[PDB]
C-alpha cells in the first residue's frame, strides 16, 4: 500500500524532470556549432615511447608540471616517468599487483593507487630517506577501487565497485564523506577545476554530480545504454563527457542538466575506456577497445583524427595541464606521448 | 645527458630499468591460477599445503620446483565482467563443483558456461574439480540424480551418476582448442596438488611448444 503509492510518486517525479529538461531543450549543440569551421585533420606523432612495464597498463596520470607522469601496471609496479627524457624517476613496487587506478597529487609530493584489494594506498615521494614509502592505506570500501583523484595533499576522492564514492582525510585515514546513490559499480570519477564538485559514472549507465562539501548528489545524468567506464570534466567545469561500452561518448551540461551531443561512429562497435579534453576543450580524445584512440571535435561531433600506435586496448589516456601533449597507455605495456607539428 | 646531473639522472634510470627486468623474469616463473566455483564448493580448502599470503585472496604454495599462485575472487560481490579481464594472462582456471548440493548444481552449470566461453578465456584451460564425491555416493542412494537433472535417464549407480555430471560441464566447452582437466576428489583427499601439477605441466608443454615454434 504505502510502498506502491511511493514508487508511483517517483515515476511522476521522473516525468517532471524529463518534461523540465525537454522544456529547456530549445536548440541542439549541433545546430549551434554548425556555422563554425571544422578543426580539420588532427595529425599527432609518437614523440616518446615509455618502455619498462611488463604487463597491462591500467592507469596513468600527468603531474601538474606537465613533465612527470605516473603509470600503473599489473606487473605490480608504479612508475614515475620523466616524459621529456623518458627517464624513470621512480619505480614503486605495489603490495597488490591488481591495480586499476593511479593518481598524481597536484603538489607532486604524493601518488595514489589501488585496485581489487579495495584499498587506496598513498605513497610519499618526498622523504628524507630518499625512497618512496606507503604513507596511508585507505580502507573502508567493500569493492574494487576504480578511480581516485587528489583534491590536495590531505584530501582524496575515491570511487569503488561497491556502488559508493568516498571523500577521505588522508592524515586521519578516515572517510569524512560517503557518496551513495549509484545502483551499479562506479567505474570512474572526474574532479571539477575548482575541486568543489565531482562527477562519477557507474555501471547503471548514469552519471551523478556530487557536491564535495555538502556530500549529496546534485544532479543525475542518464542516456547511456551500457556501463559507463570513463568520465572527464570540461575545462571550464560547466560540462563533462562520458564513455560507455555502447561505443558512444556523450557531452552532458551541468546547468542545462541534459545531454548536448553524442560522439559515435558506425564503424565503432567497441567499448570506450578513457576520455579527456584538450586544454581549450575543443578536442575530445577517447580510448577504445579496438586498439585506437579517436580524437573528436567536441563542438561538431566530428572525428578529427586517430592515434593508432598500440597493439592492444587503449586502457587510459591523459592530457597535460599546459595542453602540450597527450599520453596513451595500453594493455600492450607501452606508453606513448603524442603531439602535432606545424 | 649533457649535464653532470643529467648524466647521473640517466644512470639512475638505467639502474631502475635493470631491476624491472629482474623482477619481471622472476614474476614469469610463477604459475598463476584463477580459483572459481560456487559460494560453498570447497575452493577454500582445495589444497591443504597452501597458505594465504572482501578483496582478492591470494594463496601461494610450491610443489616440485614450481610456484603456484591461487587467486580466489569470491569476495568481490561487484560485477564480475568489470574486473575479470585482470586475469586474462592466467595459466589455468581451477573450477570447484560440489556434487552433494543439488540446489547449487545448476548454479555451477551456468557459472561454468559463462567462464568457459568468456571472451578473455578462449585459450585458457580449466581444471575442473568435483568435490565431495564420497558424500555424493552416500547421498545418491536416497536422492536420485534425476532430482537435479530431470533429463537424466541413465542408471542410478554411483559410477555413472558422477560421470553424467562431468559430461554436463564438458559439454559447455564450445572451443576445440580448450582442454578441461576433470578430477573426482573427496574431502579427505590429499593429492589435489599433484592433480593440479599434472594438469599444469600438460599446459606448460603446450605453451612451450608454441614458444619453440612447433605449434
Amino acid at each position, epitope marked *: 500500500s504505502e510502498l506502491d503509492q511511493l514508487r508511483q510518486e517517483a515515476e511522476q517525479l521522473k516525468n517532471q524532470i524529463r518534461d523540465a529538461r525537454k522544456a529547456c531543450a530549445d536548440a541542439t549543440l549541433s545546430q549551434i556549432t554548425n556555422n563554425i569551421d571544422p578543426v580539420g585533420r588532427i595529425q599527432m606523432r609518437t614523440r616518446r615511447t615509455l618502455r619498462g612495464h611488463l604487463a597491462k597498463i591500467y592507469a596513468m596520470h600527468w603531474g601538474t608540471d606537465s613533465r612527470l607522469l605516473v603509470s600503473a601496471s599489473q606487473d605490480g609496479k608504479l612508475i614515475i616517468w620523466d616524459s621529456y627524457t623518458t627517464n624513470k624517476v621512480h619505480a614503486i613496487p605495489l603490495r597488490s599487483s591488481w591495480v586499476m587506478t593511479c593518481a598524481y597529487a597536484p603538489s607532486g609530493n604524493y601518488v595514489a593507487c589501488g585496485g581489487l584489494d579495495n584499498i587506496c594506498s598513498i605513497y610519499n615521494l618526498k622523504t628524507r630517506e630518499g625512497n618512496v614509502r606507503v604513507s596511508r592505506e585507505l580502507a573502508g570500501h567493500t569493492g574494487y577501487l576504480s578511480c581516485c583523484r587528489f583534491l590536495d595533499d590531505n584530501q582524496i576522492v575515491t570511487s569503488s565497485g561497491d556502488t559508493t564514492c568516498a571523500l577521505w582525510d588522508i592524515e586521519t585515514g578516515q572517510q569524512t564523506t560517503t557518496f551513495t546513490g549509484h545502483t551499479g559499480d562506479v567505474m570512474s570519477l572526474s574532479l571539477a577545476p575548482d575541486t568543489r564538485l565531482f562527477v562519477s559514472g557507474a555501471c547503471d549507465a548514469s552519471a551523478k554530480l556530487w557536491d564535495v562539501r555538502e556530500g549529496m548528489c546534485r544532479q543525475t545524468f542518464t542516456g547511456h545504454e551500457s556501463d559507463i567506464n570513463a568520465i572527464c570534466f570540461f575545462p571550464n567545469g560547466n560540462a563533462f563527457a562520458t564513455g560507455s561500452d555502447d561505443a558512444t561518448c556523450r557531452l552532458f551540461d551541468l546547468r542545462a542538466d541534459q545531454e548536448l551531443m553524442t560522439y559515435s561512429h558506425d564503424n565503432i562497435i567497441c567499448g570506450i575506456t578513457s576520455v579527456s579534453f584538450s586544454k581549450s576543450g575543443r578536442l575530445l580524445l577517447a580510448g577504445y577497445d579496438d586498439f585506437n584512440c579517436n580524437v573528436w571535435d567536441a563542438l561538431k561531433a566530428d572525428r578529427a583524427g586517430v592515434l593508432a600506435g598500440h597493439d592492444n586496448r587503449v586502457s587510459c589516456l591523459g592530457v597535460t595541464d599546459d595542453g602540450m601533449a597527450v599520453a596513451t597507455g595500453s594493455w600492450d605495456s607501452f606508453l606513448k606521448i603524442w603531439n602535432g607539428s606545424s | 645527458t649533457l*649535464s653532470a*646531473e643529467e648524466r647521473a639522472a640517466l644512470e639512475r634510470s638505467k639502474a631502475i630499468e635493470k631491476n624491472l627486468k629482474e623482477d619481471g623474469i622472476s614474476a614469469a616463473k610463477d604459475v598463476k591460477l584463477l580459483l572459481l566455483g560456487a559460494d560453498n564448493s570447497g575452493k577454500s580448502t582445495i589444497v591443504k599445503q597452501m597458505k594465504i599470503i572482501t578483496g582478492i585472496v591470494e594463496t601461494h604454495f610450491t610443489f616440485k620446483n614450481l610456484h603456484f599462485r591461487l587467486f580466489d575472487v569470491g569476495g568481490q560481490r561487484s560485477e564480475r565482467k568489470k574486473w575479470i579481464h585482470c586475469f586474462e594472462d592466467v595459466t589455468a582456471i581451477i573450477f570447484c563443483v560440489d556434487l552433494s548440493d543439488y540446489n547449487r548444481m545448476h548454479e555451477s552449470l551456468m557459472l561454468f558456461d559463462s567462464i568457459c566461453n568468456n571472451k578473455f578465456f578462449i585459450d585458457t584451460s580449466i581444471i575442473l574439480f568435483l568435490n565431495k564425491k564420497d558424500l555424493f555416493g552416500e547421498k545418491i542412494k536416497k536422492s536420485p540424480l534425476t532430482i537435479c537433472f530431470p533429463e537424466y535417464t541413465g542408471p542410478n549407480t554411483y559410477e555413472d551418476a558422477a560421470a553424467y555430471i562431468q559430461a554436463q560441464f564438458e559439454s559447455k566447452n564450445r572451443s576445440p582448442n580448450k582442454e578441461i582437466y576433470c578430477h573426482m576428489t573427496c574431502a579427505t583427499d590429499t593429492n589435489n596438488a599433484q592433480v593440479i601439477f599434472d594438469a599444469v605441466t600438460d599446459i606448460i608443454i603446450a605453451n612451450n611448444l608454441r614458444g619453440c615454434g612447433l605449434y
Partner: single-chain antibody
Framework: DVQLVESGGGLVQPGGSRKLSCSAS????????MHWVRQAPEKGLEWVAYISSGSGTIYYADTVKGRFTISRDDPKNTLFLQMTSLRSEDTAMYYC??????????????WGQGTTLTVSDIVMTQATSSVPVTPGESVSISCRSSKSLLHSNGNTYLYWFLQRPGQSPQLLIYRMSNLASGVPDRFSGSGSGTAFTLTISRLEAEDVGVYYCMQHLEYPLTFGAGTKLEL
C-alpha cells in the same frame, strides 16, 4: 634521522696512508651518490671525489687523482676514502656529503659532521670576503663564474651553502633558485648567466656564517672563496 658519521682522521706523517670511513644511517644509502669535500683550515671548501649510486661512475679532483680512492659498501652503508702519499696540502676537514640525482631532486642536501686530517675548471669568485650586517636588515651576497652556468635544458647549476661557526655546511639554494627543505623562505636565490645574488631578507642571528657558492655544471665541482657575515 638522517646521519653521516665520519671516522679515521688524525695526525699522519707525510707520505703516509690513511683510511677514512663514512657510516650512513637513517636513509637509503645505496640510492644516493656520495661526495667527499674538504676544507683547509681558515680556507674555503674543496671538492675531493664523487662516487655514484651503484658505483658505476667515479670522479676525482686533479689535485688528488691517482692518490685517493673512493669506494662504498652498500650492504654496510659505509663510504670509504683510501688516501695514499699524503702531503701537507691534504691537511683539511673532510666532509661526507650525500647527493641523489633525479628530476627535481636536491643534491648536496645533507652533509656529515666531518673528520679532521692533519699532515706533519670553472672559477667561482666571491670577491667580498666579509660583510658587516645587522639583524633584521636585508643582505645580498654576490657570486661570479668564469663560464655560464645556464645549461641548454634551462637549469642553472649553482648552489648556495651556509657553514655556521662550528657546524657543517647546509644547503640553502640548489640550481640557483630552488629553496632547500628546512630552509626559511627569507633566503632567495637570483642570478643570470655568470652573475648570481643570494638575498637574505630580515637577517637573524642563525644566518651568521660563511656562505659558499658551488657550481655543478661539470666536474670538477669548484667552490667560491666564501663570504662571511659578521655582526
Amino acid at each position: 634521522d638522517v646521519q653521516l658519521v665520519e671516522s679515521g682522521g688524525g695526525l699522519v706523517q707525510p707520505g703516509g696512508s690513511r683510511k677514512l670511513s663514512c657510516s650512513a644511517s637513517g636513509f637509503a644509502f645505496s640510492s644516493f651518490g656520495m661526495h667527499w669535500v674538504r676544507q683547509a683550515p681558515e680556507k674555503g671548501l674543496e671538492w675531493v671525489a664523487y662516487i655514484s649510486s651503484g658505483s658505476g661512475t667515479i670522479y676525482y679532483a686533479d689535485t688528488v687523482k691517482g692518490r685517493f680512492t673512493i669506494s662504498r659498501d652498500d650492504p654496510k652503508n659505509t663510504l670509504f676514502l683510501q688516501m695514499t702519499s699524503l702531503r701537507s696540502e691534504d691537511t683539511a676537514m673532510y666532509y661526507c656529503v650525500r647527493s641523489i640525482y633525479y628530476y627535481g631532486s636536491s643534491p648536496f642536501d645533507f652533509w656529515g659532521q666531518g673528520t679532521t686530517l692533519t699532515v706533519s675548471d670553472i672559477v667561482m669568485t666571491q670577491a667580498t670576503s666579509s660583510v658587516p650586517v645587522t639583524p633584521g636588515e636585508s643582505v645580498s651576497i654576490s657570486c661570479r663564474s668564469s663560464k655560464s652556468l645556464l645549461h641548454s635544458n634551462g637549469n642553472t647549476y649553482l648552489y648556495w651553502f651556509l657553514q655556521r661557526p662550528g657546524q657543517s655546511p647546509q644547503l640553502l639554494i640548489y640550481r640557483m633558485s630552488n629553496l632547500a627543505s628546512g630552509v626559511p623562505d627569507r633566503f632567495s636565490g637570483s642570478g643570470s648567466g655568470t652573475a648570481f645574488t643570494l638575498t637574505i631578507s630580515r637577517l637573524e642571528a642563525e644566518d651568521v656564517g660563511v656562505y659558499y657558492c658551488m657550481q655543478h655544471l661539470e666536474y670538477p665541482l669548484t667552490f667560491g672563496a666564501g663570504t662571511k657575515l659578521e655582526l
